[PDB]
Amino acid sequence: NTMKYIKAADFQSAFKAVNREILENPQFVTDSRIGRCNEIGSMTVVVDTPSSFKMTDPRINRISYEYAEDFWKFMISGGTDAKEAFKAYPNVAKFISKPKSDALPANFNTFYGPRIAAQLPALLKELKEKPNSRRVVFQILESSDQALLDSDETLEYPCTDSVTYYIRDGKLYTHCHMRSQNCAVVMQLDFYLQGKLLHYIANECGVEVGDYTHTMVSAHVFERDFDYVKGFLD
Amino acid sequence: NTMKYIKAADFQSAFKAVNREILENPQFVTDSRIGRCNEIGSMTVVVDTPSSFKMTDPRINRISYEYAEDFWKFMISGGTDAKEAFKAYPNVAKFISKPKSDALPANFNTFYGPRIAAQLPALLKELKEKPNSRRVVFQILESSDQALLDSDETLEYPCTDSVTYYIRDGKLYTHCHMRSQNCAVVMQLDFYLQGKLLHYIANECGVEVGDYTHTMVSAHVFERDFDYVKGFLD
Numbered sequence: 161n162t163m164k165y166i167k168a169a170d171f172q173s174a175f176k177a178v179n180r181e182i183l184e185n186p187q188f189v190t191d192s193r194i195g196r197c198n199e200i201g202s203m204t205v206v207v208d209t210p211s212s213f214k215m216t217d218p219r220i221n222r223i224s225y226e227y228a229e230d231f232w233k234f235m236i237s238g239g240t241d242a243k244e245a246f247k248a249y250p251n252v253a254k255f256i257s258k259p260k261s262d263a264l265p266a267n268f269n270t271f272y273g274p275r276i277a278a279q280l281p282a283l284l285k286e287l288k289e290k291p292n293s294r295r296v297v298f299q300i301l302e303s304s305d306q307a308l309l310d311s312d313e314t315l316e317y318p319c320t321d322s323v324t325y326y327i328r329d330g331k332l333y334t335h336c337h338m339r340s341q342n343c344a345v346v347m348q349l350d351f352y353l354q355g356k357l358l359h360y361i362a363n364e365c366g367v368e369v370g371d372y373t374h375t376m377v378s379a380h381v382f383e384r385d386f387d388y389v390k391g392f393l394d
Numbered sequence: 395n396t397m398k399y400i401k402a403a404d405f406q407s408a409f410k411a412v413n414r415e416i417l418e419n420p421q422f423v424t425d426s427r428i429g430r431c432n433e434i435g436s437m438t439v440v441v442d443t444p445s446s447f448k449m450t451d452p453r454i455n456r457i458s459y460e461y462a463e464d465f466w467k468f469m470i471s472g473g474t475d476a477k478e479a480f481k482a483y484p485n486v487a488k489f490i491s492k493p494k495s496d497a498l499p500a501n502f503n504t505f506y507g508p509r510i511a512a513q514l515p516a517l518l519k520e521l522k523e524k525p526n527s528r529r530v531v532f533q534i535l536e537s538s539d540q541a542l543l544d545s546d547e548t549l550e551y552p553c554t555d556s557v558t559y560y561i562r563d564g565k566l567y568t569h570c571h572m573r574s575q576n577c578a579v580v581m582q583l584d585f586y587l588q589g590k591l592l593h594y595i596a597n598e599c600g601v602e603v604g605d606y607t608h609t610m611v612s613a614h615v616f617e618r619d620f621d622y623v624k625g626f627l628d
């Protein structure tokens with residue numbers, strides 16, 4: 161029976177449990193926009209100890225932590241010079257290029273950083289000043305991104321939907337809602353970025369960290385990555 | 395031990411199980427923006443049979459289905475004449491009034507309907523024409539709503555974050571992500587609206603319905619409603 165709720169002590173244990181479940185007990189085996197994948201709809205993953213966002217198993221190597229840290233610095237700095245930030249990574253070129261279509265502006269991008277930066281002042285104020293607020297939600301995916309749907313663009317239509325932060329009894333709790341998660345590869349990056357971001361937020365607020373929840377409307381592993389996943393299970 | 399994952403056959407069974415768990419095994423007992431409540435962070439609720447969105451127990455009566463249907467017609471019609479639509483319900487007046495602050499425009503509102511209406515053409519096209527798309531996400535809560543955070547407005551800062559639809563093997567699956575859920579009262583309305591909306595979407599696409607997932611970053615019951623909840627449990 162497909163297990164959709166996964167609670168783990170640390171990010172790596174969650175990572176491995178999620179990938180094992182998608183490989184072994186998929187809800188769907190489906191031909192997607194970018195190839196065949198095993199998929200579980202609406203997975204919920206809980207990580208008890210979010211400081212563990214850098215996974216230790218060197219076999220989980222498709223996202224190097226050099227790349228993850230460069231991505232983090234690029235994202236938290238809120239800039240748009242992705243060509244410079246990622247010049248050492250030619251394979252990401254199709255995700256950082258200028259919009260081809262005249263429909264949306266040439267300054268249009270779907271980088272998370274500028275959106276986080278735009279919302280940080282209002283969201284930090286709420287998080288710091290309104291006790292026990294439920295209102296602190298970073299919007300990543302935007303309805304204005306829907307202009308990408310019927311286009312030939314290669315820009316990311318944001319896989320991350322929103323990140324909610326809330327503080328109870330001195331601890332920061334985090335809920336990252338993913339529209340779409342490549343659980344074998346990109347989730348290593350997403351776990352790193354979300355781990356860094358929540359510690360950034362917790363430090364800004366002067367609070368300690370509670371736990372981390374990761375919901376994924378589509379949690380998938382592409383068939384082309386099954387061997388890679390098997391390489392780090394066991 | 396606090397149960398955060400609840401799977402139920404129908405909306406009412408989920409409703410009762412969620413409320414029982416918040417009352418009996420809260421994660422937090424917290425003083426919120428609008429009073430003390432029991433709370434469970436990041437609850438996931440699965441409803442197997444989403445046609446059941448009208449609950450049958452007449453003791454669950456704080457959201458009348460006359461009101462719920464009027465709300466539905468108002469929302470799906472995409473209009474902004476809330477004063478007319480809800481004239482028979484004086485108690486909702488503070489949620490439908492014009493913005494008081496000069497900061498945001500006087501046409502500003504947080505009604506779901508116009509936002510659903512704005513996104514329906516692009517999202518239906520994706521849902522109908524891109525096979526096995528993961529991209530169909532109705533954004534409800536918007537970052538532009540953050541202008542409400544440091545204001546004295548009584549308008550709803552959207553409790554509903556997003557609603558994701560996807561189709562696999564002839565069936566529509568729905569994932570409603572709630573930022574904030576009053577599980578005893580308003581969740582009856584939210585279940586009704588989301589049940590109606592997903593059947594609207596499924597009919598537009600000519601597909602049958604799969605199941606419904608409801609995630610809630612804050613799932614709470616106000617202490618002032620504990621007696622009401624106890625009245626419909628058992």
Ligand SMILES: Cc1cc2nc3c(=O)[nH]c(=O)nc-3n(C[C@H](O)[C@H](O)[C@H](O)COP(=O)(O)OP(=O)(O)OC[C@H]3O[C@@H](n4cnc5c(N)ncnc54)[C@H](O)[C@@H]3O)c2cc1C
Pocket residue numbers: 222223242246251252255256271315316317319342345346349
């Ligand atoms: C701003 C930004 C947005 C991004 N958005 C997304 C996104 O939405 N989705 C996403 O998936 N990634 C996205 N990325 C990229 C992501 O961060 C990772 O770089 C990527 O997921 C790595 O996947 P991969 O290991 O398959 O690398 P890839 O670059 O896809 O593959 C590794 C390289 O090795 C080659 N290769 C290795 N073995 C073989 C073989 N046997 N046969 C043929 N070729 C082989 C491949 O051809 C390829 O060039 C984004 C990056 C940036 C900077």
Ligand SMILES: Cc1cc2nc3c(=O)[nH]c(=O)nc-3n(C[C@H](O)[C@H](O)[C@H](O)COP(=O)(O)OP(=O)(O)OC[C@H]3O[C@@H](n4cnc5c(N)ncnc54)[C@H](O)[C@@H]3O)c2cc1C
Pocket residue numbers: 456457476480485486489490505549550551553576579580583
């Ligand atoms: C566009 C829109 C947006 C909305 N947004 C929200 C929202 O964000 N959050 C939300 O909670 N609701 C919201 N609502 C309202 C919601 O849809 C329901 O109407 C509401 O949640 C009903 O809650 P209630 O049963 O506590 O009713 P209430 O109106 O809160 O209470 C019932 C009435 O009975 C009175 N009453 C009954 N018994 C007693 C007693 N013993 N002592 C004193 N007074 C008593 C109360 O004073 C009150 O007037 C919205 C409505 C609309 C139309």
Ligand SMILES: Nc1ccn([C@H]2C[C@H](O)[C@@H](COP(=O)(O)O)O2)c(=O)n1
Pocket residue numbers: 193194316317318319320340341342343346347350528529
């Ligand atoms: N931060 C991100 C951005 C994207 N993706 C993945 C999910 C899909 O594998 C693909 C996006 O394709 P789609 O838009 O069809 O869901 O990239 C991811 O896992 N994490």
Ligand SMILES: Nc1ccn([C@H]2C[C@H](O)[C@@H](COP(=O)(O)O)O2)c(=O)n1
Pocket residue numbers: 294295427428550551552553554574575576577580581584
């Ligand atoms: N569709 C909606 C809109 C709002 N609320 C509830 C959640 C909170 O009880 C309150 C919103 O307050 P807050 O913004 O502080 O979360 O209304 C809800 O349950 N469903």
